[PDB]
Amino acid sequence: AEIYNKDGNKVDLYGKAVGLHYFSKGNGENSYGGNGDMTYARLGFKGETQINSDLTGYGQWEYNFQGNNSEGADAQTGNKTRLAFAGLKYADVGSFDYGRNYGVVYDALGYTDMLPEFGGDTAYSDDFFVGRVGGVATYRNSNFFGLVDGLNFAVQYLGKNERDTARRSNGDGVGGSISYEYEGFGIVGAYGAADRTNLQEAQPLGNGKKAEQWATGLKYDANNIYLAANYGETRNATPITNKFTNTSGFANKTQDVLLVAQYQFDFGLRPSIAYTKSKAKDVEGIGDVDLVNYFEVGATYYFNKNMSTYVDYIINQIDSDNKLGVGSDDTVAVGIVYQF
Template identity: 55%
Template sequence: MKKSTLALMVLGFLASSTSSQAAEIYNKDGNKLNVYGKVKAMHYLSDDNSKDGDQTYVRFGFKGETQINDQLTGYGQWEAEFSGNKDESSSTTKTRYAFAGLKYANVGSFDYGRSLGALYDVEAWTDMFPEFGGDSSAKTDNFMTKRASGLATLRSTDFFGAIDGLNMTLQYQGKNEGRDVSKQNGDGFGSALTYDFGGSDFQLGGAYTTSDRTDAQQATTRGNGDRADAWATGVKYDANNLYVASMYSETRNMTPISGGFANKTQNFEAVIQYQFDFGLRPSLGYVQQKGKDIENIGDADLVKYIDVGATYYFNKNMSAFVDYKINQLDDNNPLGIKNDDIVALGMVYQF
């Protein structure tokens, strides 16, 4: 069946990052500057009063590059998020990305700043739910599992031009102290490999990180080892309007819990979505994180839910969504983690 114009636009959008949909505002003498952003007008429905209510926010950023010579390009990116659900005297702003780097031809790139950790090269494949998802081992400012500070990252496409479809990430993270214990980290290293078999619709990936833990982290009641380690492996298929992905990972002395950190976690995520030609994209997913050998507890689920949702794309800039998080945690779980269901309703405008 011939795809409609809308379906082609939507599929192109889903295959691209937010910044690649940016509006070009300057392009002269080898210098380019794009701006991008989105408004997510969203409301949560839940018996958990801390989650129920308005969740609206705005994100805005720029992505620029400069042509230094025939082979070398400089680039930078910054993105911030602004709360839209608070009164004006208590509105908050946070920096999501802020990095700069150099890219040499089609060989690879190197950048430094606040960006994405190496483990997220694989974890991102299942972080596709309309609102929820991607929250087992991937946590912001938790070593190199998601967005984090002080990252020096070397990325190579097609393994320095030698093997089509084999992409590599090598990463170093500098020490970050003087913040909440759960957000600290010592010096660490990470790596990731993804391979699409030379351009196929099927992709495999694996990632590993290891870091020193700070003195404050080692002094916590739970999870007091001197190193934090994680590994992840994943698979995805993205073709014929169908998206299917799954991810399994494990962490050691890394995942924050009440009283410190889990000695070990086992994490599984899966998602399946289908893009209809008329704009509808239903989504079904599952996320589970099990803590192992927790002091005075033993094994316990930390995250466990089924996710049912759908997004309708009016065009590449405007969409509406609903996402239902069906919590599967026990009512009397030993760590006192809230287990209320949440329904998210919203509309998104982005450019």
């Protein structure tokens, strides 16, 4: 919601209140998404001020507030800051911002991150270039300096983040994307690579000093039709765990495929169909393991632009014999979302 627009500085304060609930067999510890209340909310703001007629300053902050906690000690479990950055966009040169923001490889993975609830599996947060990250300096350029419509590129610089965890840690690195949008087609390629840190190298699963991720997208988005596909691979970057040996680390290699098919009816119904398959390769002592695999059937029914509800169903293809001990049961999400 645009709560303010005076003296060329508009502030968009927005939020969400998602009544949500998962359904999985038993206590669902063996299910794709889990079982239980999953209600949460959001709050944030994106500001934009015009320094002049070419230069624009902008800032954004988004925060997730969990609603499925009690007002006891667990109150904060899950609350986190999702985005926080600032920048200046200028004429045709391009934009530059810095802070907690999405990694460039997300640009590609973005194409398939359209499911009602689930999906987006390979875009782990705090995992180098595929999801939200801390301290990334990003430079994007539009229409190749205005010369070519639809030709976009960006180069990101990931700063080293040595945290308490190997999972949330990352060394420094660089990445970049290139996308061309035309008619209702989009084609993307993005890649990045950064140093793994000592703690990361110290983990039992995964071996290397350089983690690199890359993926490409293709999409036909026009005339109530959304079709998109993603494919990517990674070296020592997808976090994994062996539930049996109680070991953790990263998959040495992974072949990722994401597919989406969605149609937007006029009356508000927007069914969804998708396929997700992530397979780790060269996992020590195991070899090839499916980290994710399933089919999705879903439907979001938008009332107006500030209301909707959706049902998401995950036909979990993962089998019980999974080596890493991944869950094999299905999950069903049922949400009702109010926003502004």
